[PDB]
Design a protein around this ligand. Structure first.
Ligand code: CL
Ligand code: ZN
Length: 128
């Protein structure tokens, strides 16, 4: 179902300068409220379309962008996830991933930003 369109909803959460520090534990990091404000009520053709726009908006956020290296900003500018610490990769999965907290399977919203978290590839697996 992430291969089909819909409209982003949700509020996201307040975040600070240590956004993504805990993406490798628990249920990961929330969608920042500031980013949710940019994406809410917009239409997306696919979840990949959403993910690209999500990271693009991160790169344009003055608070979030300064938490990342120039190359990671360059990735996010074109919709690519920033790279994780080396210790948090799994195989060829080397950049942060988006996770649905209530699974798509159980009617968790695909584009519900209050159902989406940011996780390391390593942590993502464990939740699955
Ligand atoms: Cl809502
Ligand atoms: Zn997941």
């Amino acid at each position: 179902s992430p291969e089909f369109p819909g409209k982003a909803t949700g509020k996201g959460k307040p975040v600070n300068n240590k956004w993504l520090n805990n993406a490798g534990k628990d249920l990961g990091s929330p969608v920042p409220d500031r980013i949710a404000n940019k994406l809410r009520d917009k239409e997306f053709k696919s979840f990949d379309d959403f993910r690209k726009k999500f990271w693009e908006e991160v790169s344009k956020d003055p608070e979030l962008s300064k938490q990342f290296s120039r190359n990671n900003n360059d990735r996010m500018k074109v919709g690519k996830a920033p790279k994780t610490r080396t210790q948090d990769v799994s195989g060829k999965r080397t950049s942060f991933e988006l996770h649905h907290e209530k699974p798509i399977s159980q009617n968790g919203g695909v584009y519900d930003m209050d159902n989406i978290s940011v996780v390391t590839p390593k942590r993502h697996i464990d939740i699955h």
